[PDB]
Design a protein around this ligand. Sequence first.
Ligand SMILES: O=S(=O)(NCc1ccccn1)c1ccc(Br)c2ccccc12
Ligand SMILES: O=S(=O)(NCc1ccccn1)c1cccc2ccccc12
Ligand SMILES: [Cl-]
Ligand code: NA
Lengths: 177, 169
Amino acid sequence: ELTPEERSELKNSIAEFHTYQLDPGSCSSLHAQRIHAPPELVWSIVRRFDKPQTYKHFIKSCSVEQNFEMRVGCTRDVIVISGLSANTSTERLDILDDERRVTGFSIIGGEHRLTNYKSVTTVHRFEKENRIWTVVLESYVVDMPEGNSEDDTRMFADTVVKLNLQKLATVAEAMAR
Amino acid sequence: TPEERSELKNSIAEFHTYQLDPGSCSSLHAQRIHAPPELVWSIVRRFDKPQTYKHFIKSCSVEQNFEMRVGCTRDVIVISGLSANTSTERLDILDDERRVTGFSIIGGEHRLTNYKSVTTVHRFEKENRIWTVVLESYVVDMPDTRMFADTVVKLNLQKLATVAEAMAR
Ligand SMILES: O=S(=O)(NCc1ccccn1)c1ccc(Br)c2ccccc12
Ligand SMILES: O=S(=O)(NCc1ccccn1)c1cccc2ccccc12
Ligand SMILES: [Cl-]
Ligand code: NA
C-alpha cells in the first residue's frame, strides 16, 4: 500500500493518464504496486506489447502480425489458458510513450463477456536519498454487464490486474537481484 | 536454500510421495513464510475456510454440524471467470502434531480428475529468528490443465504468505 508521500507524488499523473470519462453502465479501477527496482528496467518489461506473458498470468500464447511494428494501432491476439472462461482476446495498442513511460491497450474483440475493456499503465521513479524504487499504476474501465450478478466478472478482472502486478514486481525484482 | 532442502527430505518421503497411475503426474512446491509455524499451520488447517488463504473462492460450504475429521467434505464454488465451476473436496489427512493436511477432489464440474493434494508446515529457527517453510504437492490425471493447477497452487501459496506475514506483524 502506497505511502501518503507516494500518493501525493502520483496525484498529477493519476489525473493525466488514469482519469476516465465514463459511460452510463461502466466502471473504473486503479491499482498500485511498489517495486524495489529501477524504473527503466520495469518499463522495458511493461512496454513489450507483443509479450505480456512475461508479467501476466494465464497467458497460453500471444501472437501478432508478421510484419509487426509495435506502434500504436497494432494488435495482438491473446490466447488464454483453458481453465479460464475466456478464450481469445484481440487487443489493440492505444498508447506507448517511452518518454513518459505510459502504455495502454483496448480490447476490440474475442469470445468473452467483458465489453469495451480499456486499461492504462504508467511507471514512476522514486529517488529517496540512498535508494530508488518504482511504483506502477494500472487503471482500467469496463462496461457493467447485463445479466444476473451470478455472472459478473468485474471482480475477476480486478484480481487479475492485481495478480499480474505482483508477478511484474517479482519478475522485475529478480532482474536487479 | 540448500540447507532448508536437507531437512525436508524426510517429510517429502512420508507425505509428498505418490504412487502414480499411468497418465498422472506429481508436483512439489515450496514457500518461505516469515511468521511462526503455528500461525501458518493454524491457517492452513482450517478446512472449512480455504478462502482465507486461496484465490478465487466464491463460496465454501461445509455443513452445520461440521466436525473437522478426515472424511468430511466441503463444497466450493469458484469465482466466476473460471471454467470449472464447483468442486467437492474431502479431507484426507489431518495431523496437528506433525502439521499435515490434505484433501482430494471427489466431485465437481470440471476436468481435474483425481486431483489430490498434501501440505506441510515446517519450522526454521536461525540466528534468533524463526520462520516457516510450507510444502505443497499434488497429483492429477493428465489426458493444457496441469499448467493451470500449478499456477493456482503457486498463487495460493503466495497468498498464504501474505496473509500470515500480515498477521504476525
Ligand atoms: O476448488 S478449489 O478450492 N480446489 C483447490 C485447488 C487448489 C489448486 C488447484 C486446484 N484446486 C479451487 C480453488 C481455486 C481454483 Br481456480 C479452483 C479451480 C478449479 C477447481 C478448484 C479450485
Ligand atoms: O486476455 S488477457 O490477457 N487480457 C488482459 C486483461 C487483464 C485483466 C482483465 C481483462 N483483460 C486476459 C488475461 C486473464 C484474464 C482475462 C479475462 C478476460 C479477457 C482477457 C484476459
Ligand atoms: Cl503463469
Ligand atoms: Na465464468
